[PDB]
Amino acid sequence: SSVILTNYMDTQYYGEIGIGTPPQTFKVVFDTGSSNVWVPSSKCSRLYTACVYHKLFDASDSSSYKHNGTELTLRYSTGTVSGFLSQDIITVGGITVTQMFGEVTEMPALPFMLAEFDGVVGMGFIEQAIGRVTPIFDNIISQGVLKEDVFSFYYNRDSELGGQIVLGGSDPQHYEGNFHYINLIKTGVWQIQMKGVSVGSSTLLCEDGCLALVDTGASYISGSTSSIEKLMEALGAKKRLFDYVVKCNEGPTLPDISFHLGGKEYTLTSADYVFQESYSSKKLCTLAIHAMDIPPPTGPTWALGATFIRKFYTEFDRRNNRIGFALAR
Numbered sequence: 001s002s003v004i005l006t007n008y009m010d011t012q013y014y015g016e017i018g019i020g021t022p023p024q025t026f027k028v029v030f031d032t033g034s035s036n037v038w039v040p041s042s043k044c045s046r047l048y049t050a051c052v053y054h055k056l057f058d059a060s061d062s063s064s065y066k067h068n069g070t071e072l073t074l075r076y077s078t079g080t081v082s083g084f085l086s087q088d089i090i091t092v093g094g095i096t097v098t099q100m101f102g103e104v105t106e107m108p109a110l111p112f113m114l115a116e117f118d119g120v121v122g123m124g125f126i127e128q129a130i131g132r133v134t135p136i137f138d139n140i141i142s143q144g145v146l147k148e149d150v151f152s153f154y155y156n157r158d159s160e161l162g163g164q165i166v167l168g169g170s171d172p173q174h175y176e177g178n179f180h181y182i183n184l185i186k187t188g189v190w191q192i193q194m195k196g197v198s199v200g201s202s203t204l205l206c207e208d209g210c211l212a213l214v215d216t217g218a219s220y221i222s223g224s225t226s227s228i229e230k231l232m233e234a235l236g237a238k239k240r241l242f243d244y245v246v247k248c249n250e251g252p253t254l255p256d257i258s259f260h261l262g263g264k265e266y267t268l269t270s271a272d273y274v275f276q277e278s279y280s281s282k283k284l285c286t287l288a289i290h291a292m293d294i295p296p297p298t299g300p301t302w303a304l305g306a307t308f309i310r311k312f313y314t315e316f317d318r319r320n321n322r323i324g325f326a327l328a329r
């Protein structure tokens with residue numbers, strides 16, 4: 001089973017799922033960086049403008065709904081949501097699974113007014129599930145229907161398909177060469193060992209090794225403030241409140257950046273990490289790489305998001321607790 005995804009500004013990738021009977025449609029980000037499922041709730045006060053602007057799940061319209069009510073709070077690096085647990089039938093790419101999810105009743109304007117999607121579908125391990133709720137992929141696996149215990153991601157560059165997630169396998173149509181795997185530091189987190197980071201010809205970062213969170217729910221490639229300050233100075237990038245910029249005319253001249261993962265160099269070009277929306281030396285261009293201090297136990301860790309996935313098709317192998325990368329096509 002595959003799910004078609006929409007690409008919004010190269011920063012948000014989402015597809016649709018149905019919840020309840022009849023199905024209530026929602027735009028959701030399939031996020032390997034979290035493990036819970038949630039959508040905005042009809043019980044969300046309209047004082048929360050973000051709830052006025054998104055699709056709200058209304059339990060009172062679903063005959064397959066099952067009440068639970070346990071409260072939960074989901075904390076992401078760029079924001080937080082709070083609400084309660086509910087159960088209903090979810091439809092994902094033709095697959096139907098009974099699933100427990102969060103009905104969000106508190107959704108902050110910043111940053112959710114800026115979200116094109118309504119909710120999130122965690123693709124992480126149950127070990128990271130808030131409220132110890134069974135992750136949706138686990139529940140789909142218990143149906144013994146998928147050919148393989150894996151799922152893959154394809155994030156296209158913006159255009160005008162935006163992206164594609166395959167449940168149970170990979171789509172040869174979107175990658176060339178063969179995969180190259182790296183085992184997880186440990187099951188429970190889509191995180192792997194990173195042997196080094198280099199800017200141009202000089203592994204001036206992550207010597208001695210570091211951690212890499214392969215996050216489909218993250219827009220950019222992130223590192224610790226420390227690491228990024230170093231990387232950026234090398235790029236001659238000026239730091240702003242939320243991002244780093246360069247004079248647009250300097251974008252094309254920026255050096256390559258490579259990530260040493262499992263004995264293989266994954267290199268990004270300036271075209272791969274700068275939003276070149278001009279060549280003017282009188283305009284600033286943002287970089288698709290940010291400083292993001294991720295706390296323990298997961299962090300400090302680097303995070304490989306959409307910026308990286310765009311270039312490398314990614315397969316998340318549950319059965320072998322490994323991640324595979326291949327040249328996206």
Ligand SMILES: CCc1nc(N)nc(N)c1-c1ccc2ccc[n+](CCCOC)c2c1
Nearest residue numbers: 011012013029031033076077078111115217
């Ligand atoms: C998908 C949920 C999510 N997962 C992870 N692992 N990290 C985040 N920072 C967010 C998170 C939260 C709020 C956002 C509000 C606006 C835009 N984004 C970026 C969406 C990424 O699409 C790939 C957001 C991302």
